[PDB]
Every structure is written in C-alpha cells, then in structure tokens.
Design a protein around this ligand. Structure first.
Ligand code: NAP
Ligand code: NAP
Ligand code: IMP
Ligand code: IMP
Ligand code: IMP
Ligand code: IMP
Ligand code: IMP
Ligand code: IMP
Ligand code: IMP
Lengths: 473, 473, 473, 99
C-alpha cells in the first residue's frame, strides 16, 4: 500500500487513524464496480458474517447469501442442527425470499411476534402449502392476543408465478396496498414472496452459489477434540468453506488442527485465525490454510485488550498480514471492529479479501435473537461474545460442576449488549445496501473497477483525531 | 508556507491542528487591511456562499454581494428561476437594502412571519409603490392573526432621499423610535431602507459589482447532461462566474465538462471541483479551469468520510492544492468545514484565494428556509446536503420509480440539520462582521496589509489537541 | 532546559503536554526553598496579578503584596484613582491586615454584604477610629435588613497592641470564639486585624516592599495616546514597576512606546508585551524593556485563537522567549492560561522569572467584583477580558456613537464568565498557599533551593493525553 | 422613600419596596433633587453611591395642586411619580396617577 509522503507514524493505526485520497478515475458509475472476491469464498460482495451464535442463524444465512455474502455457522452448533440449516439454505430460491408463514389457527399473539423474523412487513397465511391471506402489523393492532389469524387476515393479495421477471413484479406492486407479491408454484403452492425492494436488489446483487446453483454457507470448528472428524462431518453436511477459529491462532494446537484438516483433503477453502502478525500469517498458511483470519481484540464484544493488553490496531494488522499472505499466494479476512462502511472499505484497501462482521448484524430482523424493546419503545436485540460466561456456560454444560467452576476463571467477552435496530431500515439487507454503496463509492474515488484494483491503486494518509472529526457523523 | 523548525508531522493537518505565529507588523489599524481577492471572482471580502439550496437564495445573494461576497446559485435551479433571481440581484441598490414590504390588506399573521426574511426588524407598508407605514414585531404582539396590517401599522417614520450620505442617515436615526430610515425616490416611491448598522457597513464593505456597476452573482452547473448548453444559458442569463461542481472532481466526466465549457469561450471565471490532490488540481486547470474548488469530506452536511473513508484533512489539502494551482497561475477555493473565523483565516494562510461557506449561513434570516423554533423557543433553520435523500428526491423527481429506487442506494449527505440563529445577531451580515474582523486581525498579527501578503508572510506551527484547547471557545 | 532523550516532538507544547522528572536532592525541607525572583520586580513569590479590571483592585493589591506578589493596576484606571489606590497600599501595615469596618449606624443589610470583601470572617465596628465590637455572618442571620449594626455586634473581642509577635497572637486566639485579634495603636485607635492563619503566613511569606519599606504596586499603560506622559504620571504617583501592554506586542507602535518611556529614565523596571517569538523578545528588549510579557491567546477570557488562529502553545512560547531574553540579560513573564499550581511550576521551569495570573484570582473575596450566588447558592464572581465588548464600552464611552459603532466590529474577549469561589478557601491567600506549596515541592523534586536552580537543574519530558490523565484530577 | 446621595445602591435597592410608588426621592437639604427606580440600580455595583444613578429629571408640582391636573401631568411621564413640593421648595411627598 502507498501512503502520502512523510506519513510514517511511530505507532500502529486503526481504521480511525487513516483516510483514502481520491485519484484519477474513469469509472463512470458506481454500479460499474465489480465487488466479487478472489479468495475462493465464492462471495460476490466482500462481506462475511461472523461465527457468532447471536448473529449466524438460518434466516441470516439465507438472506445474506442471496445478496452475495456468506454466513459462518458457529462451532457450538450440533451436527444435526448444522445439517438441517444447510439443507434449508440450499433449498432456497435465488430470487424469491422465504416469508413468515402462519396457520389460520395461529393466535394473533404469535402472528405479531413472528412478523419481525423477516423484513417483509407481512406474513403469508398458508393452508396445506397454499397461500390464503396476508397478515401485517396493522391487522394485529388492537385485536385480542388470542383471536385467530383467520379473523384478521387480508383475503386479497397480489400473486405471480415463480420465475416471473423481477422487473415486472416491481411494476405489479406499484399501486398494491401491500408491498408483497406472493410467488406461487405451477400447482398453486407457496414458493415465497418478493417485495419492490427485493426486486430491485435482484438486479443489483448476485447470489453466492455453489457448483450446483444453491446458496453458499460456511461452518466453523474449534481446535479442541477431534478436529479432523468434526471438519469431515461439516464437509459431508454440505458446508462450502471451513473456518478453524480460536482466540490465539498462533499456538501449536492450532497448527496441528490445520494439518489434521488439510491432510483429509476435503477440497474446500480453509480459513484459520486469529493472528495479527506476519509470522503467524505465514505459519498458518504453511500449516495448510489458504485464508488467514486477522484480528485480536477489535471485536465489539471483546474484553481481551483490557484483560491482557494483547492486541493490535486492526488496520496495521491487516496491512502487515495481507502482505505476508500475498507473498505465499494466500488471502486475509479482516475480522472485528466494523462499525461503519468506511471500516469495510479501509480493510479492503489494506489488502483483505473479505471482511467479517459480527455484532453490527445482530441488530437486524434476520438475526437469531428475539426482538426486544426498551422503556422508550426503541427496538433492539442482544449480542454477546463467544468467549463470555454466557457462551462458555452453554458450550460446557456437559462438564462437572468442579470443572465448570475452575474454567469460570477466564472470561474475555461480554455476556450481554444492546444492539439497536434502525427504526426505518431494520433489515440486514438494508445494512448491506449501506455497506456496499460506500465500498462502491470508495472504488470510484480511487479509480478502481474491482477489489484487486482497489488495493493496487489506493493511496492512504494518516490523520489526527481532529482529522477523523471532519465531516458529519 | 513556512512552518516552525521541526514541525513536520507524520500526518495531514486540519484547521484545529495548526496555529499562526505573529510577526513584526507596521499595519497601524485593522481597518487598513485590504481584503480584496485576486482570483477574478470580484469579491472584496474572501467569502463565497456555497451552491446549496438551503443557503443560496436571492435574499442571500443580494445581501452578501452588497458586502463584498458572492453567492453561487445551486445547479438544481431552473433557468427561468435563475434569470428571475439574477435580474432581481442586478437591480438592487449598492447602499440601500431591500426591505420586507407589506400591503395594508395583508394579515397580521403574514406580517409576523414575513418580518424574519430580513434583519431590519421592521417591514414597510406600501400602497402603489409608496411607503405609508412601518410594522415591527412589537406591533403584532397580541393582535388577532387575521386583523389587517393597517390596524397596527406605525404611521410616522423617518424618510430620506436615495443618494443621501450614509453618515447623515446614521445621525438621523440616533433618537428615532425605530432604527429604520425609509429611502425614497424623487417621485416618492420606495427605494429601500437603511439602518444605523447598515450605514456603518456602507463605509466598511465595498460592494462586489460587475462592469455595469451591478451586484455580482454566480451560478453552478453539474457534469451530467449537456454541460455546454447549460453553461451558456447561465452565462446569457447574467452570471458573473460559473462553478462546475461534483463530489469526485477528478474523473473523466469532469474533465470533459470543463473542456466543453472552456471551448465555448464565455469570458467568465471557471471554477471546478472538488479535489484534494496536487495532481487533481493540475488536471482541472489544464482542462480549462481558472479556479479549483478544494474539499472532499469536511462539509458539515457530508457523510462521505464515514461512508467511504475518502477525504483529506482540509488544511493540508488546501496547502498542497494552492501551491499546485499557483505554479500554473491558477487559484484555489477552500470549500467546506468552516465553523469559526479562524478557519477562514487559516485557509487564506494556506494559500486559498477564497473561502466557500455553506451550513454556517443557513442559520440566518436571509437564507431561503423558513424560521423555526424548538421546544425551548430557540430560533433555528434547516440545513441539508446536496447529495442527501431529500435533495436527490427533488433533483430526480421526474424519473421512473424503478430508476429512483436504484439511485436510492447512494446517500452521502444528511437530509436535515438544525442550525441555530444567534438570538442577538441573527443576520448574515453579523456573521460577515464576525468573520472579516477575525481575518483583519490575523493580517495585522502577521504584518500583512492584504491577502497576498498574508500567504507570503505567515509562519505556522503544529499543535496537539491540548494546544487547541488553550483559550475560551 | 534539558529534555529526556528523543523527546523532540514535531509540534509545540502546552503545560499539559509536559512533565518534570525528579532528580537527586539534598533540600531537606520544602520550607528551605527560596521563592524570591531576580527580575527586578521585587516579588518574593513568583506571582504577579494581571492588569485586569475584574481582578486588580486595591484590596487585591494590598493582600498579595503583603504575601510577596505584586498587582498591576489596569491601564483604564484614571490617574486620580491610581494615586488614591497607591497611597492606600503604601500606608498598609506589613503584618496586620485591613479589616472591613462598620459604623454602628450602618444597616445589617450593608454589614452582611460588606463582610465578604475580606476573608477574615468578621468586620470591626468602629467609632471615631477605635474598635467597639465585631460583626460576623452569624450575627446577621435572621435579623431585619434595616436593623442597625449596634443591635447585633459582639461587645467583647480579643485586643492586642500593634507590633506584638505574631507567634503570641496565634496563642491568644487558641480559645477565642472569633478567630480575629483586633490590633490597636498606642492611643487605642484601630490598626487592623490578625487571624490565626494570618499570623502563620507572616512567618512564611515575606512582604514585597519598596526602598522605604512600603508594599509594592505596579501599573499598566497602553500604547495609544501620549505613552510617555502617561508613564511619567504613573511613576510620580508611586508605581514600582511599569507594564506597557497590548495584544500584538510585536508592532511598530509598541516599539515606539517602549523607547518613549525608556528615554524618560524613570528608574523603574519596564515590562512590555505580549509576544511569543524570540524575534519579538529581542526587539522589545532592544527598544528598552527589561522584562518581556509572553502569551498570545492562552488567557481564559480570550477568544483570539478562535477569531484569528493566531497564538502559540504557552510552554513552548515561554521556553523560546526566555532563552532569547537571557542572552540579552533580560527576563520573561509567563502571562495567561494558569489553572493549577503545575502551570506556575512549569512556567518557571521553562525559564520565566514571574508568572502572571488573571481570571483564577477573580473568584476570591479580595477581587473588586461583587460576590454573587447561582440558583444552587454556590458563590461565584464575574470575570471578563480587557478586549471584550464590556471592557471597550467603558474604555471608549467618551467617543462619538459613530466611532463606537465602527469599533464594535472587533471583539477578542468574552464579556462575562462565572468564576466559582472554593466554599472553604475563598481567599486569594488560600490560592497563594495552594500555588506556592506546589512550586516549593517542584523545587525539592528537582533538587533546587531557589528559582534560578529550578530552571538550571530541571529535566523535562513529553507525554500524550493519556500521560496527563495519570493521577487524580 | 427618601435617600441621601451618600446612601449605597444596596440600601437604595432594598428600601424601594417599603412603598408602592416604585421610585425613591433623593433629597439634599430637604429638597428633591433626583429619583431612583429599580431600573436605575440594575447592574450597578452594590456599594456605589446613590448620586451615581439618580435621575435628575422628574415631574414636580406644588402641594395643594388639584389631583386631576397632577394626573394629567404624568400621562406621558417616564416615571409615574410626581414630586410634590412645599412653597419653600422642600419635599412635601409624592403623588402617583392612581394616587
Ligand atoms: N465536496 C464533497 O465532498 C461532496 C460530497 C458529496 C456531495 N457533494 C455535493 O453534491 C452535489 C452533486 O451531487 P453528486 O456529488 O452526487 O454529483 P452529481 O453531479 O449529481 O453526479 C455525479 C456523477 O458522477 C458519478 N460518480 C462516479 N463516482 C462517483 C462518486 N464516488 N460519488 C459521486 N458520484 C460519482 C455519478 O454516477 P453514479 O451515481 O451512477 O455513480 C453521477 O453520474 C454538489 O453540490 C456537490 O458539492 C459534495
Ligand atoms: N495577550 C493576548 O493574547 C490579548 C489578546 C487580546 C486582548 N488582550 C488585552 O487587551 C488589552 C488591550 O487591548 P488591545 O489589545 O485591543 O490594545 P489597545 O491598546 O486597546 O489597542 C491596540 C492598538 O493596536 C492596533 N492593532 C493592530 N493590530 C491589532 C491586533 N491584531 N489586535 C489588536 N489591536 C491591534 C489597534 O488598532 P485597531 O483597533 O484600529 O486595529 C489599536 O490602535 C490588554 O489588557 C491586553 O492584555 C490581550
Ligand atoms: C473477543 N472477541 C470475540 C468474542 N466473540 C467473538 N469475537 C470476535 O469478534 C468478531 C466480531 O467482531 P464485531 O466487532 O462484533 O464485528 C468475531 O468474528 C470474533 O473474531 C469474544 O468473546 N471476545
Ligand atoms: C457532502 N458534502 C456536501 C454535500 N452537499 C454539499 N457539500 C459540500 O459541503 C460544502 C459546505 O460545507 P459547510 O461545512 O456546510 O460550509 C459545500 O460547498 C459542498 O462542497 C453533501 O451532501 N455531502
Ligand atoms: C484575550 N486575552 C486577554 C484579554 N484580557 C486579558 N487577556 C490576557 O489574559 C491574561 C490572563 O489570563 P488568565 O488565563 O485569565 O490568567 C492577561 O494577563 C492578558 O494577557 C482579552 O480580552 N482577550
Ligand atoms: O414462518 C414461521 N412460521 C411459524 N413459526 C416460525 C416461523 N419462523 C420461525 N418460526 C418459529 O420460530 C422458531 C425459531 O426460528 P429462528 O429464529 O428462525 O431459528 C422456529 O423453530 C419456529 O418454531
Ligand atoms: O417583502 C415581501 N413581501 C411579501 N411577500 C414576500 C416578501 N418577501 C418574500 N415574500 C414571499 O415569500 C416567498 C419566498 O421568498 P424567498 O424566501 O425570498 O424566496 C415569495 O415568493 C413571496 O411570496
Ligand atoms: O470596610 C469597609 N467599610 C465600609 N464600606 C466599605 C468598606 N470596604 C469597601 N467599602 C465600600 O465598597 C466600595 C468599593 O470598595 P472596593 O470593592 O474595595 O473598591 C467603597 O467605595 C465603599 O463604599
Ligand atoms: O425612606 C426611607 N429612607 C431611609 N431609610 C428608611 C426609609 N424608610 C425606612 N427606612 C429604614 O428602615 C427602618 C425600618 O422602617 P419601617 O419598616 O418603616 O419601620 C427605619 O428605621 C429606617 O432605618
């Protein structure tokens, strides 16, 4: 990477410490930028969802992969639950989304709460697999909780066959009272739904798909136990990518874990982390990893810095690690600390091939957690670290009370945090729009038409805290 | 520019990061400083009003130009509205201001709200072009909103012929109940008003006028569409200066737009921006621009930094760009981030020939927005960026709903902001006093009698955030 | 001054940016340190009170000079009021203080208000010059405001002859209900008062006195008008030191004012400021000044930095100017920005001979302003700059309304500020105890027995914002 | 309320509320010379003298004047207080429009 003349600080840099200076550009439109990655992950946008139980569920996996990202299932997930989630994701349609479905015998109480598991603003009343009505939040307003869905469902709705041009579906819904088109199979059974915004995103995002045309999904594994047997079971379950994840990725047990998985020859991309040094990046690649996950400390749920003093400013860590992996034909994932789209753009400019986002996506409809409200009726969801006392409790529940007490000495993560939803744009696809629009604008500012050209052409500068304050938050 | 020995930091600088060291001075008075610019804009004070719809209206254009600045009309303005605004500004008197005028049949409701479109504190009642009374806010206190103006108008007021020396008018109003002198034409028709403060400003500020002696006004044009045909229509409408404006001014489309306007040979100063690099400055000047607008990110309504990471600390950007423009005989406008008079002074010390100010002037009586009040009865006006959802909607309202949806992906500006009016000095001329008094003191501190000597003689230093905190805000 | 190895930052330093590293010391006690100055001011502590109308009154001048400092009377004071203040100060006792005095005919309303003009907690009731009672705040609690002093005054009080050993007076008051000994002349007339703390301070602070044994006092003069005639009148009125003062001290009008005063050969130390550059220090000294006042911007009432961007971090300014002055046999006063005793200590370590303090001392009983209370009953007093709209209004009240309106364009100071009094230690002598105890501890940490050894032996270091945060606020 | 020119502003401000006139009369040798209102003491140092803030101009009339005429003399007066004087010029008291 190139920095402005004289910008050689005597310290390491975070995303807040740096800026991109624009260059000469011939890219006429921000829609001309190709956001596809080149690390073998198969993503068409540089966004990976972290293997955190508060974020990485089946609804998130379907929604993100349709728009070009990928979700890493957490390592604490049982293999049967993994197999059920993968089979659900890989049976999803590439354009039409899975709606909330309700039986006419369901209670209005259930209908009100289930509505927010998706961002469509409406649920489809189904009977024997066929749509018979719609339910919105307005239909549940004032009704007793224990009335049935059949008493409140709207009986008329827009229907269209699966395979219809999304541009046409956009025009069908211009003057419809509900911005939902119920997509049906030739026999009349429910195939899914498609909103006006969903139709727009169909011509903007390319789905991340496997060799069979099914949505991609990844899975994580720990370094304890039989790593090889666990990795092979995840591969046979249908995972398209494997993440061997641990806090201190530069230890001997991680090196042995990588070799055990690589020697099985699963034919899948192997991600291993986390490290923040050039030496650790080389050692993980030499062990058999093709992608190195970079980040020790920056996660919004992490207390590692305050507990140990161990960490590294994430921008400088990605710059050094991406350069070391580039020498060996490897790639780097920037993992942790993403708060605004500039953090995504700056990580990619630093040399990362993908960016892993965690806590930010917990505050969305699609995340696994229940939607909550504070005293001011502001919507929010919980997030927590995978090394907190809450996560360790659910992961080690099978141990004796003696071992659980001794292990309770260590906690390097928060057990609860409030992640607010934007009152208007509360879906993960709204955040993807936010992130990708910013990255696309970064590329045209530097004159790049794709992500390799971004890292090649970017010129960076160092600023003080006053520099970061320039502009509006 | 000269910096103190050893002040060569490994980062770029904002206005907050630097300070001016005083030098030996023989300038006896701060009124002896010449504030005229030498970039061909014609401004006698180094203030340009940004081409933002929330700031640049006809009341702003008249008021600022009389005091020596210039207003750039936004590019979203229809050519008919531009012609009507230019003809209004170029028919204004050089000393006597345009008051709020009222018909005696107007409602007290209308009279109360219209008062705050000027800073005179009084409106003139007019019948067939001739003044017959005055209305103040004290006259509207308690009266029914739908009583007529004639029921509360003050029948006696100070009058004087247009052309009277402003110093005499100052003396006529010393003991008058209302500090407004109604200036009249030989036939008795209204020519305008002149307050005590307005008479003082006539001896301090030189109006910015064209070759016919009429107040100057500028106009902005985008890089899309037929830039040549638009620029020529703006020239024939009477614009004294043309601004070709876009966020990423260092792209091929901007370079072609400059050449298309330059080859038309309109005989007007040609401004193009925005860039923050020396290379960008040279490319714009070589394409045909005489003035380069500098600034990517620092605007108070901008979110470009947080969306993309793209931007440059404005002080270092002005320093590098002004030196590159100077090499080619061109000039540089410092655009964005002005919060206090020190920002204007430091930008001129960095080598800029003019300073463009936007959001700061939205919180004045003369800006186009309506005057609003919060729950605490504090006066304020709205401000918003020209690339926000609000501005883009008005600029693309005639496109199809499909295209407006796709274009909705990008938003690099805030759509609403509260800019407070100083409860005492709420007029834009009060801010011009504040700004120019600071620049004049800077010039005497360094020993400069004019703006070229300011950039020539200034010595600068770098400070930490503790240095900026010294003093009171 | 010596800095630690490698501590050569690329920016200028404030008091917050630096620290002192202790060295080997044989100074057994902090009471062994000699705080006397060597600049010819005659002060025995390194404290000078600023020539600000909100701080520099006759009660302040008496109290500080008895403890070793000196007060500079403001330049706006008429020569008649100057002569009266000097004659009051030079007739004061060197040990015994001047109390608030009351007539028995005075109202309780006046007694409770007058009580806070001194820090004694008691006023002396006087009749024909002799004491007849005491009045405390508890004696006025609940009494009608227009009852007379004779109705509430305490009739018995401790009395002692003037010249008594303060050590004994400390013992006389050990068991007295009111901590004040009324000091009397041989004929029984009131000579003043002395408290337990006041007797302690007599053995700690050496009074600053002239050649005849009378308390010292200084006076300021501006650079406009007949500077030579104004300086001579101040010399004949009894001033012990002259201060030629202006914001921009490095201008031609100041250099002529110094030469005009030096040519009169008044035999007094001549102070001139303000500058922040070595070149300005040399020019003022060569013009005839023996002491250069350093500081442009750091004053708590100043807005110069925000209006103009002109200034310099005060520590670096003092280091440079003190070094240039010492080459020419001159001295430097550190003027502005003192908030804590460390600021005084660091200014002396930087090479200043004396430290000027302004607004900090406004929040004391002895300052000329009236004592005020907020809604929470917190004691405070007003402070304001000598270049604010309030100050220039009184200074130019005799000019025409036209000129005062034109000069209203410039305002480089705030016109009102709330300076809180410490509810326990509200006297200026308490702040003197606070400041000088800190400076004495600084000298023993460095190994210095006097102020010249402090500057000679001190080793300094540079810190970040985190370094300044170490310790308790 | 009567005030000497040597009285303090602090005393003058507090004494004004012993009557409903809203103004006090400054007196030197029994003669009315100035008026003190609450607006005169607003912002002034509490221990300045009354002689610094007194209004030297006030409506005056001899005692025994018809109240109806005194009422009309005060219609446009800034202070609604008329100073009534004895034949020798000394102060006889005051008379407001409502009085
Ligand atoms: N000075 C600044 O930092 C700044 C920042 C934002 C906005 N603005 C203000 O916004 C107004 C104009 O709106 P605009 O900036 O959107 O320009 P515009 O003139 O309305 O359109 C810009 C054109 O350039 C293309 N473009 C390519 N890369 C771009 C990029 N990185 N950012 C923006 N457009 C890009 C756009 O196509 P696509 O849209 O299809 O990509 C579009 O065709 C002006 O008043 C300008 O001052 C200024
Ligand atoms: N130490 C500081 O940083 C600082 C800052 C502000 C004020 N002050 C305080 O203000 C008081 C004196 O008021 P003053 O400084 O306005 O001086 P002053 O003695 O009242 O007047 C200064 C004279 O110098 C001229 N001048 C030229 N350049 C000037 C500049 N940059 N700033 C001010 N005057 C300039 C003024 O003419 P024009 O007015 O016509 O230009 C005027 O004739 C002192 O008590 C001083 O301590 C100090
Ligand atoms: C520290 N870090 C933790 C913990 N659980 C997960 N993580 C890391 O944070 C990343 C997410 O960062 P965000 O800022 O939330 O996007 C994860 O990918 C993982 O690397 C924990 O308990 N402590
Ligand atoms: C970013 N920048 C924007 C937008 N509209 C205008 N601008 C820029 O800001 C300047 C004004 O800055 P202030 O800090 O308000 O004085 C304008 O002149 C223009 O360059 C926007 O939506 N985003
Ligand atoms: C700026 N500086 C001003 C003004 N009046 C006085 N001063 C300066 O400040 C010093 C006092 O500083 P503190 O921090 O209050 O102790 C004075 O000695 C003088 O140099 C003013 O209006 N603006
Ligand atoms: O569309 C739906 N209809 C009915 N129940 C649902 C629907 N989506 C989720 N649920 C229920 O909510 C549980 C949790 O879903 P998750 O949050 O998507 O894992 C499921 O196991 C179901 O019981
Ligand atoms: O002096 C005035 N008298 C009456 N109406 C006015 C006056 N100034 C502005 N208006 C009204 O306010 C509208 C907006 O004015 P603007 O804010 O100056 O563009 C005008 O089109 C008029 O309808
Ligand atoms: O001891 C005192 N007794 C009575 N009045 C005092 C005393 N000290 C100050 N004053 C009054 O307060 C005014 C202002 O005093 P200063 O605040 O010390 O300048 C004086 O002019 C007196 O009117
Ligand atoms: O007009 C006045 N001038 C001066 N002092 C007054 C005046 N009226 C009352 N006082 C004072 O206030 C005290 C109490 O007055 P009373 O409340 O009327 O009894 C008197 O004894 C005087 O000291």
């Amino acid at each position: 990477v190139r920095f402005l003349d004289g910008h050689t600080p005597a310290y390491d840099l975070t995303y807040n410490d740096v800026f991109v200076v624009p260059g000469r550009s011939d890219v006429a439109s921000r829609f001309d930028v190709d956001l596809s990655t080149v690390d073998g992950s198969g993503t068409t946008i540089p966004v990976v969802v972290a293997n955190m139980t508060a974020v990485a569920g089946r609804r998130m996996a379907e929604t993100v992969a349709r728009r070009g990202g990928i979700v890493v299932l957490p390592q604490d997930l049982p293999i049967t639950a993994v197999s059920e989630t993968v089979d659900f994701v890989k049976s999803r349609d590439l354009v039409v989304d899975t709606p909330v479905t309700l039986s006419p015998e369901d209670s209005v109480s259930d209908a009100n709460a289930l509505l927010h598991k998706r961002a469509h603003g409406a649920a489809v009343v189904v009977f024997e697999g066929r749509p018979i009505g719609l339910v919105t939040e307005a239909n549940c307003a004032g009704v007793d909780r224990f009335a049935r869905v059949r008493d409140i469902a709207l009986s008329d709705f827009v229907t269209a066959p699966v395979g219809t041009d999304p541009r046409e579906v956009f025009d069908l819904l211009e003057h419809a009272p509900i911005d939902v088109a119920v997509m049906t199979a030739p026999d009349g059974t429910l195939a899914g739904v498609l909103t006006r915004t969903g139709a727009i995103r169909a011509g903007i995002y390319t789905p991340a798909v496997d060799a069979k045309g099914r949505l991609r999904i990844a899975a994580a594994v720990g370094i304890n136990g039989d790593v090889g047997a666990k990795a092979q079971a995840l591969a046979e379950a249908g995972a398209d990518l494997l993440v061997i994840d641990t806090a201190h990725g530069h230890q001997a047990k991680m090196l042995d874990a990588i070799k055990a998985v690589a020697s099985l020859d699963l034919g899948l991309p192997l991600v291993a982390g986390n490290v923040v040094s050039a030496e650790g990046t080389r050692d993980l690649i030499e062990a058999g990893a093709s992608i190195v996950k970079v980040g020790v400390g920056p996660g919004a749920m992490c207390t590692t810095r305050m507990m140990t003093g161990v960490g590294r400013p994430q921008f400088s860590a990605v710059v050094e690690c991406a350069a070391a992996a580039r020498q060996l034909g490897g790639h780097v994932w920037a993992d942790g600390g993403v708060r605004h789209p500039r953090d995504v753009a700056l990580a990619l400019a630093a040399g990362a091939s993908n960016v892993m986002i965690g806590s930010w996506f917990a505050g969305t409809y699609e995340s696994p957690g229940d939607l909550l409200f504070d005293r001011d009726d502001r919507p929010y969801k919980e997030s927590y670290g995978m090394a907190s006392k809450r996560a360790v409790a659910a992961r080690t529940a099978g141990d004796s009370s003696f071992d659980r007490a001794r292990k309770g000495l260590f906690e390097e993560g928060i057990s609860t945090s409030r992640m607010s939803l934007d009152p208007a744009r509360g879906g993960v696809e709204d955040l993807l729009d936010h992130i990708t629009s910013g990255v696309r604008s970064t590329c045209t500012y530097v004159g790049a038409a794709n992500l390799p050209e971004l890292h090649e052409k970017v010129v960076l500068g160092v600023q003080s805290a006053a520099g970061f304050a320039e502009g509006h938050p």
